[PDB]
Structures are given as C-alpha cells and as structure tokens.
Write an enzyme that holds these catalytic residues in place. Sequence first.
Site, PDB file in Angstrom:
ATOM      1  N   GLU A   1     -11.155  -4.536   7.827  1.00 12.85           N
ATOM      2  CA  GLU A   1      -9.746  -4.371   8.148  1.00 12.85           C
ATOM      3  C   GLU A   1      -9.502  -4.739   9.609  1.00 12.85           C
ATOM      4  O   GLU A   1     -10.403  -5.184  10.326  1.00 12.85           O
ATOM      5  CB  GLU A   1      -9.293  -2.939   7.854  1.00 12.85           C
ATOM      6  N   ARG A   2      -8.263  -4.544  10.047  1.00 14.28           N
ATOM      7  CA  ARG A   2      -7.871  -4.845  11.415  1.00 14.28           C
ATOM      8  C   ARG A   2      -7.980  -3.601  12.290  1.00 14.28           C
ATOM      9  O   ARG A   2      -8.051  -2.469  11.805  1.00 14.28           O
ATOM     10  CB  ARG A   2      -6.446  -5.396  11.458  1.00 14.28           C
TER      11      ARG A   2
ATOM     12  N   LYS B   1       0.806  -1.213   0.000  1.00 17.45           N
ATOM     13  CA  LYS B   1       0.000   0.000   0.000  1.00 17.45           C
ATOM     14  C   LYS B   1       0.842   1.268   0.000  1.00 17.45           C
ATOM     15  O   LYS B   1       0.357   2.318  -0.436  1.00 17.45           O
ATOM     16  CB  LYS B   1      -0.940   0.009   1.208  1.00 17.45           C
TER      17      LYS B   1
END
Lengths: 55, 74, 466
Positions: free
Chosen positions: C188-189, C162
Amino acid sequence: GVVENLASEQAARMVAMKAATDNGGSLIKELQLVYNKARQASITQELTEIVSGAA
Amino acid sequence: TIVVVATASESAALQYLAPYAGAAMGEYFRDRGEDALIIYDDLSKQAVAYRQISLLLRRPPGREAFPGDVFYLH
Amino acid sequence: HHHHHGMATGKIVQVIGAVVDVEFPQDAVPRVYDALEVQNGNERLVLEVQQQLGGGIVRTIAMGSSDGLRRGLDVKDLEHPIEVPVGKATLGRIMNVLGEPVDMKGEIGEEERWAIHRAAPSYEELSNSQELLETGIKVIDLMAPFAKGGKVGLFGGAGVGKTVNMMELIRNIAIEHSGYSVFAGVGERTREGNDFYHEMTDSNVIDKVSLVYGQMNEPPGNRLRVALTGLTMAEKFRDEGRDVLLFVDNIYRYTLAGTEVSALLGRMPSAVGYQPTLAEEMGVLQERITSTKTGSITSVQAVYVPADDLTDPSPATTFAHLDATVVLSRQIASLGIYPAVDPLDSTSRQLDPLVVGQEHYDTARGVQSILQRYQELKDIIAILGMDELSEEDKLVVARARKIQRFLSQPFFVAEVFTGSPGKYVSLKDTIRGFKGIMEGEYDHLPEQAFYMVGSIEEAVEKAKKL
C-alpha cells in the site's frame, strides 16, 4: 420515383457501412486478442539469456 | 572456370575456411593483371560451419551459438 | 520471531547482502520457522533459515536488515519455531507484520502466543458440505449465491470503493451473522494510512477489524511476511465459535516479492518471469479459507491480475483458485445509482444453473434474460429512432430501467455517513418480486419514487404513496 434510387443507395450504404463496420473489419480487431499471447513470445527472448546472460 | 566441390559430410576447414583457402587458387588471375571473379554461393551453409567447432569447446561468442567470424572474418 | 531458550549458537562468517550466512551450531541446526535472534548491532535481528546446511553456515534470509553488522555477529539458539503473539483479541487496533501494532500501543491486543504457522487445508472435522451464504442485499446476494467461507474474487475498476464494502459489510454482515471480519494489506501507500484509517472513525469498524498492512517502504521479506498474522490470528476466532473473514489488498507484493525473491536467489524456477512456488502458495493458501464445524473461514480474494495476463499465473491462479468474480464498471455508477456492481459477469456456478431452486433459477433466468434481451433495446435502437417501439421496447425498457435503477437497495453504509436508511434487503422481496413485477405486472412505479428502496418491499408503497 427517382428518389428511391438515391435514398435506397445512400440508406443501403449507410446501414451496410454502420452494420458491417462493427462485424466485418471490426472482427479483425479480434485478431489483436491473439497479440495478447505474442507478448509471451517475448519471454522466449529471455530463454536465450540462459545460454548467454544467465549461463 | 574452377569450382571447389565440397560435400555435406566433409571437414569444417573447407566450408569454415573457404575464403582463406580459395585465395591461393583464385589469386592467380586477380593479382597478375587480369580479370577474375569469386562466386561466393551458399553463405549460410558456410558461415555456420565454425559454429559446431565453437560450441563444443565451451566457448560462446555469437548469437545462437556462433563464433566471432561476423566482424573479423568479414 | 522465535522463543529463544539457551542463547548460544556461535559466531558468523560472511555477511554480503541479504544472505545471512552465519555459522551458528555444528550438529545442532534448528527448523525452518525457528529463526535465530542474532545480536547484530543493537536490535535482535532474526533470520529465518530457509535451507539448513552442514558445518554451520546455513542459507538463512532475514526480514529487515542488520543495521550495520560485522563479519562475526553472535547468534542465539531457539526452541519454539515461529512464536509470535496473536489470538482472537486483535479486533481493536491496527496490526503490524510481526504480531505487534502500527497505530497505538498494546501490540494489537496481546493475548495468546502460539505457533504462527497455521494449518492450510484439512478435512475430517472440517465442514465438507460447503453451505451457501447470504450477505443481505438485492444486488449481491440475490444475483450471486456466495458460499459460507469462500474466496470470492473481485474485478472491475472503481465505483464502490473501500468505504462502501467496509461500511456496508461492517454492519450488515456483523449483525446478521456472528463473526469478526478482519483485514490485511501488503503493498500500500504511505499516505493512504493517514486517510483511509479515518474511515474507521466514520463506520465504527476499528473495534471489530484488525488492520494488518505493511505499506511499501520495507523490502520483500519485511513487507511480504503478513501471512502469519492473518492465518495465525484468524484461526483463533474461526475455531472457537465465530466466523473469521479476512480481506487482502493486492497480489503485487506476493507476486513481485515471491517471483523476485524466489528467482533472484540464484536458482531457476518457472517461465514468463514467474516462480515455481506459485502453485504451493496459491493452491495451499486458496484452499485454506474453507468452512469448518466451528466457523466458516472467509477471505476477500482481492488479487490484482497483470493487465489481463493469460500466459502468466495471474489469470490461471486467480481464475482457477477463486470462485465467483464480480466486476464493477463505470456504467452502473456513472448514471447515479447506489450499487456499482453490474449483473453481467457477476455470478457463480450455483447461482444461475439448476443446482439451487425455483427462486434462484427463475430470478437468475428472468433477470439475466430480461437484462441481456433488454440491454440492446435502449442502446442499439437509439441510433435509428423510437418509432418502432412496441410492447417489448416499452415493457423491456421500463422494466429494465425501473428494475435496474430500483434494485440497488442501500445498506448500512450511508446510515452513519450520508443519512440514507434502507437497513438490509431480504431474499424474499428480491427473489419473489424481480421475477414477476419486473417483467410485465404492476407498472405504476416511476424512476424518481422507486429510487432508494429496499429490494421490492419498499417499492410497492412508493408507487401509490409518492
């Protein structure tokens, strides 16, 4: 002149086994790709649930 | 030797109840001090005979629309 | 999330699970997007009515929860359906899933407040010519001709990351073309947001991108409702003069939330563990990112397939809904190169065929035939020996190794993070240099001096000056 028999037999078996090992029996591994569709048949195992579990 | 003849277009009580009805005609040589034998041939065409009489009355029990004759009648 | 005008409705009835069966009005039901802001507990928990019913008890589904409610919670009537706050001023801070913020204050830049349900696909005034785009690279634009405002797919594993795409695309595409490139995120986390956001402080993109991620601590309706922020916030900049460019995270939230929520509601749908709403959301959402007259609507199609499931909707929807799909393996990044995207299986339909020109046809045919015909001379010939190496092995190995190791031009990702320059690679140097000098002409460039060169323009002076 007897070295051509052992060198030609060992070289022919090594080249034939190395070249044929990636195109012959390894081609059977392509059939494993069909197994990627066999998991879809497992979805059919859920269809019976519509006549029992899901009702 | 005797043989209970039953066609494919007969009733479900003969194929589905062949064991309960065959004991009356086959028990004369077994329960009297003699030798007897029961040749139970074509089981798949008989154990499923109770399936059509079970799924039509809205009752599910066995696998693939079957009854409870695998653990009780056996 | 709707504009309440009146605050009446009625009481409720049943409240078992997430099924909001509240009896609001009798013969005055709302729309589909018009949610009823009920006063359940302390906050105003709104529930979107997916299917209206007679009597008052309609089939509604809320996003979060009621935070402990009774059997007779008071509801409220609304007027404007899906009235959230967005606009083109969202490029400055991180956004949420309901038009608010997640980082600082300001609701991710409060500006306009229109309808959250934007239009999917349309024509007439839209651009039907479908022009091509140019990212400004030698291994992205010269090898794959992307369209202006398309949903290009992505594949492969790691290698780029990313930071390379966000840092390299947040400076070259932002200065080479007028437009605001935003992003998204669903599934996501909870810790990545405390680290990946730090990358925004290493490339200066936080002031030009609206990070709208939902993490994964919420349920399906509270975390999968990020489609209104991207479509409602991206339409204000693409239909004004700029070009919007969103970026998705994965397809596990939309596929798992859509299939589990659409199939676990007591109704039958598709087979193989799928839902019947995949064709409407995938076809209606995949065709919405198209070129228009006021700006191209681009979106990074970063969908994740279910471990190459050809029988499910991931290969059919991902391979039939997107356009080009680039793959990045570990072989291009394990040797020590800049670009990890390989040239094999990383092109579109109008990038190697006879629907472009002599530059793309000669460069694609020469680079594809030279790479495919030269990739076997260095891998399959290593098991025997280098005694039978003629002009094809030396010219194909030197041209393939020097062109493959020197074609990875560095962008603006390492200019404010590592220290290496390169600016942007042009199409004339990569299209007019890789088809003649990378086959059998000017064999003076080595392997160490040819690295970190901008396409073929900087590699000419490095052969004689270094």
